[PDB]
Ligand binder design. Structure first.
Ligand SMILES: O=C(O)[C@@H](O)[C@H](O)[C@@H](O)C(=O)O
Ligand SMILES: O=C(O)[C@@H](O)[C@H](O)[C@@H](O)C(=O)O
Ligand SMILES: [Mg+2]
Ligand SMILES: [Mg+2]
Lengths: 386, 386
């Protein structure tokens, strides 16, 4: 057997050229940052992970190394299930909060344990999970077309991603619903019916404005309506879904553990569960959520947006899952997507394939890591919702 | 990458001395039988499985070899998720029925694919599933004390199993409710409060008789009431569960796929889901049911009763699952529990451990297999419920 010797959190920051900084309800992007989790063992098998973002890097590092870490030192890393519960019940739930940055921290560590397990077995994670369902590849969408655009500019950006091979893309909405509607109508007109258009309000609307927007989305044949309302307003999501349109009500990037999603399902409030393996509790928890969605005849299509590790962790799960694919691919300026590891975006007929090596299935460029240590830069401006 | 070259179903029968034949609502046992599934590949990596029983062996063999098999020949066995859906949607659901012996047949093949995957990776299945949760072992129960006994005899048999190390055991009921009650009362007095007593009616009661019995079970502090009613009467189960007693309402050995269990959960009709990996759709399907149970704050404790393969397949999953264990262990006369493979019952403080070899984790005695080919013997007498 192996024993865990260290749990490390490397805080990393990468710059965004001013002209490339985008804003949504979540805030204006400043720097693309991450924690790279490293779980090390006595025999030298190592796994890495990421607890996503934006979350404060010092908070994440402290939680990972000094709250979670001590629960892992000396333990056999093979018992991922045991360790998830030891950590959640022993420290994280009460001492960081049950729906919290602590759960994202746990997620990064869980992903590292799965990477470690795959590497120890010399197998890609998706093979551990019963192999592929999506044998030909996984349909991706370009994320996203952000705020501050004219209708023709928005349509131009969409045409651009479609040219690159994408069969679907997502539009940010919320700040100015009349502009959102104009943008959406121009975009649909430009690409026709063969391209799926997703919309994401980042919790920015109230119920009545969301009902008004849903009518537009329905007219435009939008695939889903993501975070239409505060995640705290479950009944509001039920009301939207009860309209019975072909537009899916989607949420989950800010909901944590299977428990949050159970509450939405129980209240008939959700069509697409978006639990991110790197946020909602780990690969371990995302697996459970995906299964629970299928039991209820609903879909699981994760949020994946932060770095190439959060993308890869989710992609292994998605490739293995029978849910129809609508896989989020961050197309914004992001060095953490392109330079962190040996794995890049390759679309074939609009599909991506998970990395094929052991564990997460690629190698970290530790030179890049050594060159991008965080020195206190902020990741994102203040969010909206006030 | 491997390719599947054959899917074989070995029909086996083993006798039961008349003195050891037991009866429940399911019928009088005559012979302990099974299909040993064998999936072979071009490179010679082989997996085995079992679709449980009692199901007619010819129906099983035909389904496995000639309905399911043709969907598998030539395919990569690593893609278990893909193959499950290829088989279900392509053939089994419509052409064998959605809640059928066809699903059990699929389950035997799915287990064989998981055994194959584990053997190919040189890992026990529980390691693939995220490793152990129950690191110290899995709490087992002695299954079961059957019909036809006096209270004196029932109490004595229970004391015998407790002496062997069991901390829990199950009693068959349903033919004579007043005698059942007397047996239970004698059993509880005999062993005290520290031993869990489960009850199993094998669908043999009507609603009002089950309500009356539940009062008894509550009095005796029983752990669960298994198949109290027809599996077809979901509302009846809701009514029992709505009494709010500490007695769990349990069912699932005769329910198939996650869909059956979702219907029970949606109707507030179940405390313990008993989906058997070898009946309800495979390891693949049981994993999903276990997760769905947890999401709903309910328990998954599988039915495991037929042979050492059905026991082992479930035990890998149970060991890896955070559900409190109440693991079924057939203590009746059954050569398929003792002579088929090199994995015996070993209790330590009432706990069992999964096999530790690759795949299911033990080797088949192929000489025993060869010497016990089915010759048309029946497995079980007519069941009850009419
Ligand atoms: O840019 C943003 O709005 C957020 O950081 C993302 O998480 C976004 O909600 C998404 O769905 O990827
Ligand atoms: O012996 C019997 O009653 C059945 O064959 C079993 O399946 C039983 O219901 C059990 O829970 O193991
Ligand atoms: Mg979003
Ligand atoms: Mg039973």
């Amino acid at each position: 057997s192996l024993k865990i010797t260290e749990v490390k959190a490397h805080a990393l920051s990468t710059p965004i050229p001013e002209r490339m900084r985008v804003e949504s309800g979540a805030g204006l992007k400043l720097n693309r940052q991450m924690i790279l989790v490293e779980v090390r063992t006595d025999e030298g098998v190592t796994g890495v992970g990421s607890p996503s973002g934006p979350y404060d890097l010092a908070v994440l590092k402290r939680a990972i190394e000094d709250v979670i870490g001590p629960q892992l030192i000396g333990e056999d890393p093979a018992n991922i299930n045991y360790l998830w519960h030891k950590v959640f019940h022993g420290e994280v739930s009460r001492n960081l909060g049950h729906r919290s940055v602590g759960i994202a921290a746990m997620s990064g560590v869980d992903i590292a344990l799965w990477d470690l397990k795959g590497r120890a077995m010399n197998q890609p994670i998706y093979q551990l999970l019963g192999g592929k369902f999506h044998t030909r590849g996984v349909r991706a969408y370009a994320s996203s077309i952000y705020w501050d655009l004219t209708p023709d500019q928005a349509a131009d950006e969409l045409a651009g991603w479609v040219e690159q091979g994408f069969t679907a893309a997502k539009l940010k909405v919320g700040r100015a619903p009349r502009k959102d509607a104009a943008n959406l109508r121009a975009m649909r007109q430009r690409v026709g019916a063969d391209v799926e258009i997703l919309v994401d309000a980042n919790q920015s609307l109230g119920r009545h404005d969301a009902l008004a927007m849903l009518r537009i989305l329905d007219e435009a044949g939008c695939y889903w309506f993501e975070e239409p309302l505060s995640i705290d307003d479950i009944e509001g999501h039920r009301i939207l879904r009860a309209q019975g349109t072909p537009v899916r009500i989607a949420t989950g990037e800010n909901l944590y553990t299977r428990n949050a999603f159970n509450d939405y399902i129980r209240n008939d409030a959700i069509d697409v569960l978006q639990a991110d393996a790197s946020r909602a509790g780990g690969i371990t928890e995302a697996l459970a959520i995906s299964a629970s969605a299928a039991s209820a005849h609903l879909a699981w299509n994760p949020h994946t947006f932060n770095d190439i590790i959060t993308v890869a962790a989710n992609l292994h799960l998605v490739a293995a899952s029978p849910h129809p694919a609508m896989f989020e691919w961050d197309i914004t300026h992001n060095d953490l997507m392109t330079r962190l590891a040996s794995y890049d975006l390759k679309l074939e007929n609009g599909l991506v394939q998970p990395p094929q090596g052991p564990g997460l299935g690629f190698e970290i460029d530790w030179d890049f890591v050594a060159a991008h240590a965080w020195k206190g830069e902020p990741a994102i401006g203040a969010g909206h919702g006030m």
